[PDB]
C-alpha cells in the first residue's frame, strides 16, 4: 500500500551549537584603521540582508541557555587580548612613586583625586636613566607603606603586569552581525511581548543578526535596542534574587557625560621602540567628571519599570529603588568607556525612589586608567589619556537589577543596580535569537514504488 520515499531538503531543524562568524561593514573598516573588536577576524557584511517569515511556525526559545552569548563573550575577550598583545607592556613603570597633592585649581569634590608623582625611568639607552613626572589618579595608586612617606605604587604591580593600549587603536563600539555557517539557521523571535523564554508564535529566519555594538557597561545598558511596545522585564527566575533582572526601555533616556578637564598627552620613552603616554598637565581649571540625565524622563521610565515589576510582584506592592550595597568599583558605579576614557558614575541619584501603589540629575563620576575588564584578576591595562575636553552622548536603553532578599515585610520589593558580567549585557541583544541545525533528510510514506 504505502512505501518509503526519501526526501532531501525538507524544512526540519533541531537545536544546535555552532561557531558563528561575524559580519561587519567594510565602509567602517576603511574609516577605522583598527578597532579592538577586529573587523579582520570578521567578514564584510552583505547589503540587503534577507529575513523570511516562517508563517505558522512556533518555536521554543531560551534566552538563558543560548550559546550565542557565550561565543560572543569568548570572541570579545579574545579580540581584546590579541588587540593588546602587540602594544607595549608597562613593566618598567613598577617603581616607587613620590607623590604630592595637586592643588593648582581644585574644587572641594575633586580634592586629592589627582596626584603629582615623580619617579626614575629607563631611557632608550640601557646605560642611562631619567627622572620623569606624571599625574596619577588616586584609584590607580596605593600607599606602599602605612607611614606617611608619601611613597606610592601602581595597584596592579604586586599581582600582575599592566599592558598599555596602543594610542592608535580605537574603542568605539561598531556593530557586528553574527552569521551562521552553511547548514545552520538563525531563528528570530518577532513577538513584541516575548520575555526570552517559552514558545514564540511569530518566527523568522535571518542570515545574520542585527548589528550589535559591543558596549561594555554596568548598571545601565547603553546604545542598545529598545522595546517596541512596552518595557520588558526578563529574569531567569523572577522569584530568585541570585539572578539579575534585565530591563528593556521602550523609550531611551538621553545621558550626557563629560570630563571638563582639558587634558594633554605626554610621551615618555621607556625603551628602544616603547613609549609610555602620561597625563601631562591639565590646561585650565580642573573639575570633576559627571553625567546628566533628564529627571522627568528618568521618572517616567522608572514608573513604567515599576508597573512592569508590579505585574510580577503584586498590584499593591511597593517598588523601591536603592543604590548598590557594595562590591568592586565596576559594579558599585555605572562603569562605562566613551572616547577612550573609563568613567565610573555614582548612580545613587538614579535609584532613590519609593513607589507607592497609587531640570536634570547630575551623577558624580570618577576616572581611572588601570582597568581590569571582564571580572579577571591579573590582566590589567593602562588606558592612555585622551587629549582635550570630552563630551559624550548616549542612550540608556535598559537596566541590570538585583532584588533584595530576606524581606521581613512582604508589601515592599527593593531593586538595586548591578552588573559586572557582560554576558548579561550582550544577552539583552541576543535574547531573540537561536541557532538551529537543518536536518534536510526526511522519510515519509507514499504509494510510489521503485521500478
Amino acid at each position: 500500500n504505502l512505501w518509503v520515499t526519501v526526501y532531501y531538503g525538507v524544512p526540519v531543524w533541531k537545536d544546535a551549537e555552532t561557531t558563528l562568524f561575524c559580519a561587519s561593514d567594510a565602509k567602517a573598516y576603511e574609516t577605522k584603521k583598527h578597532n579592538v573588536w577586529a573587523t579582520h577576524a570578521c567578514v564584510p557584511t552583505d547589503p540587503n540582508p534577507q529575513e523570511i517569515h516562517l508563517e505558522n511556525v512556533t518555536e521554543e526559545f531560551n534566552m538563558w541557555k543560548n550559546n550565542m552569548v557565550e561565543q560572543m563573550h569568548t570572541d570579545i575577550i579574545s579580540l581584546w587580548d590579541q588587540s593588546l598583545k602587540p602594544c607595549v607592556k608597562l613593566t618598567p613603570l613598577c617603581v616607587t612613586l613620590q607623590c604630592t597633592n595637586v592643588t593648582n585649581n581644585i574644587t572641594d569634590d575633586m580634592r586629592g583625586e589627582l596626584k603629582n608623582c615623580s619617579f626614575n625611568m629607563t631611557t632608550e639607552l640601557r646605560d642611562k636613566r631619567q627622572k620623569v613626572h606624571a599625574l596619577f589618579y588616586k584609584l590607580d595608586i596605593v600607599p606602599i607603606n602605612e607611614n606617611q612617606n608619601t611613597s606610592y605604587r601602581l595597584i596592579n604591580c604586586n599581582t600582575a603586569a599592566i599592558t598599555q593600549a596602543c594610542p592608535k587603536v580605537s574603542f568605539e563600539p561598531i556593530p557586528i552581525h553574527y552569521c551562521a555557517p552553511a547548514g545552520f539557521a538563525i531563528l528570530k523571535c518577532k513577538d513584541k511581548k516575548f520575555n526570552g523564554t517559552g514558545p514564540c508564535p511569530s518566527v523568522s529566519t535571518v542570515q545574520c543578526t542585527h548589528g550589535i555594538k559591543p558596549v561594555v557597561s554596568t548598571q545601565l545598558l547603553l546604545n542598545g535596542s529598545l522595546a517596541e511596545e512596552e518595557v520588558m522585564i526578563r529574569s531567569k527566575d523572577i522569584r530568585n534574587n541570585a539572578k539579575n533582572i534585565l530591563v528593556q526601555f521602550n523609550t531611551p533616556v538621553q545621558i550626557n557625560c563629560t570630563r571638563p578637564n582639558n587634558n594633554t598627552r605626554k610621551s615618555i620613552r621607556i625603551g628602544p621602540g616603547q613609549w609610555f603616554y602620561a597625563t601631562g598637565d591639565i590646561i585650565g581649571d580642573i573639575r570633576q567628571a559627571h553625567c546628566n540625565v533628564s529627571k522627568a524622563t528618568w521618572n517616567e521610565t522608572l514608573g513604567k519599570v515599576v508597573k512592569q515589576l508590579r505585574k510580577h510582584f503584586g498590584n499593591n506592592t511597593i517598588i523601591r529603588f536603592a543604590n548598590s550595597s557594595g562590591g568592586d568599583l565596576e559594579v558599585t558605579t555605572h562603569s562605562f568607556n566613551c572616547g577612550g576614557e573609563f568613567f565610573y558614575c555614582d548612580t545613587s541619584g538614579l535609584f532613590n525612589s519609593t513607589w507607592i501603589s497609587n531640570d536634570s540629575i547630575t551623577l558624580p563620576c570618577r576616572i581611572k586608567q588601570i582597568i581590569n575588564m571582564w571580572q579577571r584578576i591579573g590582566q590589567a591595562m593602562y588606558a592612555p589619556p585622551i587629549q582635550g575636553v570630552i563630551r559624550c552622548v548616549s542612550n540608556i536603553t535598559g537596566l541590570i537589577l538585583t532584588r533584595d532578599g530576606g524581606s521581613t515585610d512582604s508589601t515592599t520589593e527593593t531593586f538595586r543596580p548591578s552588573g559586572g558580567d557582560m554576558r548579561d549585557n550582550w544577552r539583552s541583544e541576543l535574547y531573540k535569537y537561536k541557532v538551529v541545525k537543518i536536518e534536510p533528510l526526511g522519510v515519509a510514506p507514499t504509494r510510489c514504488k521503485r521500478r
Partner: protein, 125 residues
C-alpha cells in the same frame, strides 16, 4: 539563494515538498580563521555524509526518491491526507525520530544491495 529558505516549515508536508531545492542550495557555503575553516569543513563533511546516504539507497542526484521498502504501520499508522495535507515535516520528524534508523537500515543494506545484485544478474542475461 537565501530567498524562501525554510519558508515552508509551517506549511503542510506536501506544500513543503515543492521547495526542496531552496533548502538544498542553502546547505553548502588567525585562530578565528581556523575556527571558521573547521565550521566550513564540517559543513562539507555533513553534506558528503548526506549524499553518501542517498547514494547507498539508489537515490543519487534525487531530491525525491522512491524505494522498494514497504511502510510499516508500527512506524506510523496515519492516513495519507493526515500526513501530507494536515502535518508539517517538523511534526513528522518528531513522530518518526525513534524509527528513523530502522528505515535507514532497511534502505541501507537490504533494498539497495539486493536490487543492485539483481540488476547485475539481469545484465548477465
Amino acid at each position: 539563494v537565501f530567498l524562501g529558505f525554510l519558508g515552508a516549515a509551517g506549511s503542510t508536508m506536501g506544500a513543503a515538498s515543492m521547495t526542496l531545492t531552496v533548502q538544498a542550495r542553502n546547505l553548502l557555503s588567525t585562530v578565528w580563521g581556523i575556527k571558521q575553516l573547521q565550521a566550513r569543513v564540517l559543513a562539507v563533511e555533513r553534506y558528503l555524509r548526506d549524499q553518501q546516504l542517498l547514494g547507498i539507497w539508489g537515490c543519487s542526484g534525487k531530491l525525491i526518491c522512491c524505494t522498494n521498502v514497504p511502510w510499516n504501520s508500527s512506524w506510523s499508522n496515519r492516513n495519507l491526507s493526515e500526513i501530507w495535507d494536515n502535518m508539517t515535516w517538523l511534526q513528522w520528524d518528531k513522530e518518526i525520530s525513534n524509527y528513523t534508523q530502522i528505515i535507514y537500515g532497511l534502505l541501507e543494506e537490504s533494498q539497495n544491495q539486493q536490487e543492485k545484485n539483481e540488476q547485475d544478474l539481469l545484465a548477465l542475461d
